[model samples]
Target: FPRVKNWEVGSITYDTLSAQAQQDGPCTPRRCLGSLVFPAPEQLLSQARDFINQYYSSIKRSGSQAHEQRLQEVEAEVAATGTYQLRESELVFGAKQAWRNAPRCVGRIQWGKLQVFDARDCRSAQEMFTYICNHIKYATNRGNLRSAITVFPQRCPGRGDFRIWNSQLVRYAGYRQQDGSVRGDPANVEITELCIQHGWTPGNGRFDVLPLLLQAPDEPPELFLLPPELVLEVPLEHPTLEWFAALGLRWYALPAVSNMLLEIGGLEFPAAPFSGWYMSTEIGTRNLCDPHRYNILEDVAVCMDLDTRTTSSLWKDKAAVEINVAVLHSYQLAKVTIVDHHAATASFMKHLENEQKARGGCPADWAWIVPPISGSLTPVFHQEMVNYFLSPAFRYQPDPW
Candidate 1:
């Protein structure tokens, strides 16, 4: 058993659940590979068997007649077609479990609250667009963003996989400029270029929303512009700094990760777009302040007349806090849903305790679970955790063209 500790409160727990990890991660006797952001399959029947058994156990029906019948139904389907479809209830349960099992997420306390949209019957890029549009509309909920995922059809042998080209459902366009500088979000330059190459008329602003690139199996990708009304944006303005509003910074309400593959019970859905509300630090610390991103810290610092001349002044720290406050304030002012790092991490600690009792241990990537900013100020900063893989899981996949 691996013993974990919370240095802040001096409580210790053992991770017995790690013993059940189905596969090995990229670690060895030489060293622990714990800090990296990343880094699969089984004989289908056994995997299917294990997951089905797991599902039945969740409902207290393991080894029951219905459970055996479901196992037979799956085996029979696989015997004939080499694939099996998850029943609707199973799909919902699997999707929630994937969220529960995601190691990088800090908002897993609400894992049971997710609204799973089944798009398994979708057949065309246009249909994917319609489904995606509905997802955005439903998840955004007019700034009261909801946790949701729209799961597309699963991948199959002899078929080109369905894909969403953009990493997220919403992203600002990044245009490379004449002087080789990025006009918008530098992180999105490749995606922005892809959209333009695919016939989108490029916008000449700092925050132009990129269009969606939806692809159906064996078909060319199609472009679809999200309705401006469907995208709920909060213009960042500090609670006290009136000058901050003049800067005109903004971000979208929903954080829908689109290009990840969702694996459940030996089945893979290559285009399951999932959305949740923002964590303030994610926007304030990473998106706005990352030198490779919008890089707004120096700009905001200068506006506040803070000395950027030396690291001794802690100017970056002061400005970053204000930016984070502005994100939280603006979202609240706009009636949008967002969580501050303090609250998000505290809830995650609660989630850890719940999982410790319910599942013996929780799979947590401490580096990712700890908020990007104020790492030590939060409770999770002091907690030692175990990282492991679990399914159903959402996994990163290569971009499509």
Candidate 2:
């Protein structure tokens, strides 16, 4: 870890007292050199190694705990489970096995209502699943929100190898009902659609679609539903993706939390890799000596020894073990303002505090590792939505004479 110590003053100059004695008073201007000491490269290396170890360890622990809990839940459900009593006469569009094994048939409807009576009730199940899927598909296609859902065949790695078919789902359920009409809340609607499409519904008895909903009130509508597939094979390089890679690493472009302005202004350092770094001093002053007068520094440097043979020499290995960090700094000068920093930070915070006061404490300072690609794709999607609306898929005719 980096340590802050007294500044190495280069020189100091003050007004002569003799001149002040003849006048009313004396005013002096002083100059000093203070440094914001960052950890040495070698120290950083050691810290990085420890951080990587701790990170992987934490991930493993969390995964293990989650898996254990999942196993317990599954075991309880399966143990307490009852056979899916079905009537031979109620069969509809597909074979008996298709009704049982197919992903599309997971939840089907029976008769005319929106309710599902049994697992084989393809009509109700299909309708519910389709409704959710269509919501997500349409919202995403129309660029209504940045959301997605994936259906997998098995429990994802962090959980277990059990053939858990339905795992995660992201849904936005909260909507508004007004003037005898029902309207979807932009954020909620977008997420709900995502959840249904992804099939992240609660276990059989649960009424809601989303099983585990982690929501940040201040954030745009988004949900993270754990899927059954143990390891999600997220593309290492997607043209337009914002979430973490399946491998648990982020792309290079997205900014981590440590780099945000608040952290920067406060001069806080990250403690682990992928954390962030910040420096808060007069924008021009470069020293780590002064504790007062806006001289604060923070960083998430690594701690490892490269000279040792036991350590891996690869950069990826280093990155894995190293403490990732972002940098932040604060300025006390009267002229300094929020505008001096990145526009995203200022704009986001301002919006969060003003317009979105109900959900104001948002994580506004962090930047994404990847710049969003939505700007390029949104227009195309919007056009497609309009075209689809103008020409309904159900109404098609042969070429005109």
The local lDDT score (0 to 100) that residue 175 gets in candidate 1 is 97
Clashing pairs in 1: none
lDDT for model 1, please: 0.92
Q: TM-scores for all candidates?
A: 0.98, 0.18
Q: Tally clashing residue pairs in candidate 2.
A: 67
List ranges where model 1 is wrong by over 4 Å: 40-42
Worst 10 residues of 2 by lDDT: 384-393
Local error of candidate 2 at 328, Å? Answer: 24
lDDT of 2 by residue, 1-401 (tens): 11112122221222121121211211234632111111023332332233223223434554465445533443343345411111222111112211121111101111011111222222222233433344334323322122211111111223211111121223224233445322322323434444555554523211123333221112222234423231111112112222212222111111111111111101111110011111211111221212221122221112223332434544233322221111111111111111112332333323323322421121110112111222222221111000001000011111111
